[PDB]
Amino acid sequence: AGKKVLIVYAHQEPKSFNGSLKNVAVDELSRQGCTVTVSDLYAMNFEPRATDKDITGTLSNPEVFNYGVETHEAYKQRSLASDITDEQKKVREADLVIFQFPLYWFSVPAILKGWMDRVLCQGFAFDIPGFYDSGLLQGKLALLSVTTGGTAEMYTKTGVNGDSRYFLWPLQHGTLHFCGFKVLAPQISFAPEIASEEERKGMVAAWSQRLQTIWKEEPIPCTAHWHFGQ
Amino acid sequence: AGKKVLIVYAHQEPKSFNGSLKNVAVDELSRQGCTVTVSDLYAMNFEPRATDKDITGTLSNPEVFNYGVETHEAYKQRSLASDITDEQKKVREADLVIFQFPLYWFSVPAILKGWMDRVLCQGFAFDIPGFYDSGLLQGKLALLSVTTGGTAEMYTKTGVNGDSRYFLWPLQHGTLHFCGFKVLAPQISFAPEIASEEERKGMVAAWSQRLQTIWKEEPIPCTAHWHFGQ
Ligand SMILES: Cc1cc2nc3c(=O)[nH]c(=O)nc-3n(C[C@H](O)[C@H](O)[C@H](O)COP(=O)(O)OP(=O)(O)OC[C@H]3O[C@@H](n4cnc5c(N)ncnc54)[C@H](O)[C@@H]3O)c2cc1C
Ligand SMILES: Cc1cc2nc3c(=O)[nH]c(=O)nc-3n(C[C@H](O)[C@H](O)[C@H](O)COP(=O)(O)OP(=O)(O)OC[C@H]3O[C@@H](n4cnc5c(N)ncnc54)[C@H](O)[C@@H]3O)c2cc1C
Ligand SMILES: COc1ccc(OC)c2c(C)cc(=O)[nH]c12
Ligand SMILES: COc1ccc(OC)c2c(C)cc(=O)[nH]c12
Numbered sequence: 227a228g229k230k231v232l233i234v235y236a237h238q239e240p241k242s243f244n245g246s247l248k249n250v251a252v253d254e255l256s257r258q259g260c261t262v263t264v265s266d267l268y269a270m271n272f273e274p275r276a277t278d279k280d281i282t283g284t285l286s287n288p289e290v291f292n293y294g295v296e297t298h299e300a301y302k303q304r305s306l307a308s309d310i311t312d313e314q315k316k317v318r319e320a321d322l323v324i325f326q327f328p329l330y331w332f333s334v335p336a337i338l339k340g341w342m343d344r345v346l347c348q349g350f351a352f353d354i355p356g357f358y359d360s361g362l363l364q365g366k367l368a369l370l371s372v373t374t375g376g377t378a379e380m381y382t383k384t385g386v387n388g389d390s391r392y393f394l395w396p397l398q399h400g401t402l403h404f405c406g407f408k409v410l411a412p413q414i415s416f417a418p419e420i421a422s423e424e425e426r427k428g429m430v431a432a433w434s435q436r437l438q439t440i441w442k443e444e445p446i447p448c449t450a451h452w453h454f455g456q
Numbered sequence: 457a458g459k460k461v462l463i464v465y466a467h468q469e470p471k472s473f474n475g476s477l478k479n480v481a482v483d484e485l486s487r488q489g490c491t492v493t494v495s496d497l498y499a500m501n502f503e504p505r506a507t508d509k510d511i512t513g514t515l516s517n518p519e520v521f522n523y524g525v526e527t528h529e530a531y532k533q534r535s536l537a538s539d540i541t542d543e544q545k546k547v548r549e550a551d552l553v554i555f556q557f558p559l560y561w562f563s564v565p566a567i568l569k570g571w572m573d574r575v576l577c578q579g580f581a582f583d584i585p586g587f588y589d590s591g592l593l594q595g596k597l598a599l600l601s602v603t604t605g606g607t608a609e610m611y612t613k614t615g616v617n618g619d620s621r622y623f624l625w626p627l628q629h630g631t632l633h634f635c636g637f638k639v640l641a642p643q644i645s646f647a648p649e650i651a652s653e654e655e656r657k658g659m660v661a662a663w664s665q666r667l668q669t670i671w672k673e674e675p676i677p678c679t680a681h682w683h684f685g686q
């Protein structure tokens with residue numbers, strides 16, 4: 227229907243399994259009539275470091291630099307660097323944000339971690355108070371579409387890696403729920419380098435097939451119980 | 457003495473509270489007679505992105521870029537960029553690696569996330585297969601020293617943030633354990649911005665005093681049960 231989608235994509239290689247999942251997302255959401263934007267972070271050379279270069283004006287305190295204080299104040303004053311504000315505009319307009327990435331060290335690749343660190347600033351994505359259920363991005367949906375080297379069996383409670391949900395907690399709860407997103411159940415595509423040609427093809431189509439009905443899903447309960455059990 | 461320590465430090469401001477923790481660590485460990493080296497990532501302008509610039513000479517496939525594959529071969533062929541191999545040399549020589557950083561989004565700042573992604577490469581830190589215990593940095597100790605914005609009550613099992621140990625999982629287990637480290641208990645310094653100028657001292661001293669007997673310490677048991685169970 228009339229919905230805007232931002233895909234934040236973090237993979238160096240267009241011909242990759244990630245590039246395929248990103249392209250089927252664009253193809254399918256386009257086909258439905260959605261408005262679609264992609265931030266391809268590596269192709270943008272997106273800057274991941276949180277530095278004093280992200281504020282253009284007089285610093286609230288130039289003697290002792292505090293990145294969170296200075297960016298909050300820069301956001302209010304409109305003196306944040308324009309690569310940050312460009313991304314904030316995409317996220318403000320979007321109804322659903324999809325993050326497409328390969329799992330690196332049980333988390334996102336650094337370039338994507340830098341997008342989170344720099345774009346989700348105080349005043350824009352949350353305030354104090356104004357976080358978790360009162361976060362500023364309330365009304366928006368987010369979804370992580372994650373690829374892994376490890377197999378599904380490896381990511382079970384009694385597997386070596388532990389359950390897949392355990393690694394989702396900092397991203398789903400600590401970032402996305404904190405900012406007020408409702409979180410849709412993650413898409414995890416396990417061990418596509420191991421899988422056969424039929425199996426990889428089935429994983430791509432399972433994602434295209436899920437996206438056909440994405441606007442009918444309910445969000446997960448983004449609680450400790452969902453992630454950890456017990 | 458005779459022990460080597462690497463401190464990988466990620467804060468933009470020398471006068472920061474992280475800055476004071478790093479400086480107390482260098483002072484106390486140097487006083488004990490340890491060999492101490494610090495990687496000040498922001499001062500080094502350390503590159504956080506995983507790209508094809510991490511490999512010198514020609515690529516073992518310049519048509520489909522695969523970071524894991526390309527770096528693995530580059531490592532074995534002594535063809536990694538010198539920023540990465542400088543860090544690996546420090547790590548190989550170290551008996552204890554201390555990471556000193558503010559918590560950003562229940563994780564490390566992206567510049568430190570980038571150190572993990574680019575320095576801890578296959579062949580160096582682990583192999584495929586090659587990990588957890590067949591895991592190449594076995595024998596070394598690692599320690600996370602984290603500062604937070606949110607007070608310790610927020611980080612209780614029924615605080616809004618959940619248990620501290622929930623966010624340590626990807627770093628302690630999925631990164632440090634995976635590579636073979638024994639993980640010392642994390643030094644978590646809750647909420648220094650909310651002062652007082654006084655109790656900001658009790659935290660710096662407990663860290664100083666804890667470093668006095670650091671080599672006597674018992675590693676945590678780095679299991680799903682420690683981070684999650686009862
Ligand atoms: C620094 C680093 C840290 C990592 N940490 C972890 C970790 O903590 N946990 C973990 O489990 N893994 C980890 N990995 C492994 C990583 O998560 C996997 O390598 C990545 O998820 C696989 O995705 P890809 O897109 O690169 O696969 P690719 O290598 O591109 O794809 C696999 C195959 O799919 C094929 N393909 C592409 N498009 C299609 C299509 N349309 N249809 C059928 N096939 C297609 C490709 O040609 C290729 O042969 C890490 C890797 C690195 C480099
Ligand atoms: C992008 C981003 C994401 C964040 N995500 C989270 C998160 O997920 N969870 C969370 O809990 N928090 C989070 N925070 C907040 C962050 O973790 C804290 O702001 C940070 O940990 C505070 O440490 P600092 O060194 O920067 O404190 P500082 O502000 O530098 O220091 C506190 C005070 O101590 C003073 N000081 C310096 N040296 C000494 C000394 N010797 N003795 C006494 N005082 C001294 C300083 O002058 C300062 O006034 C986030 C922050 C940002 C910017
Ligand atoms: C790197 O390639 C990988 C393939 C499979 C994995 O499976 C569990 C991992 C993990 C767990 C950590 C890691 O760094 N890399 C992995
Ligand atoms: C100074 O800012 C903060 C203080 C306390 C926080 O958590 C208890 C956070 C979190 C979770 C995210 C963030 O971005 N900033 C925080």
Ligand SMILES: [Zn+2]
Nearest residue numbers: 399403448449
């Ligand atoms: Zn949640």
Ligand SMILES: [Zn+2]
Nearest residue numbers: 629633678679
């Ligand atoms: Zn472990």
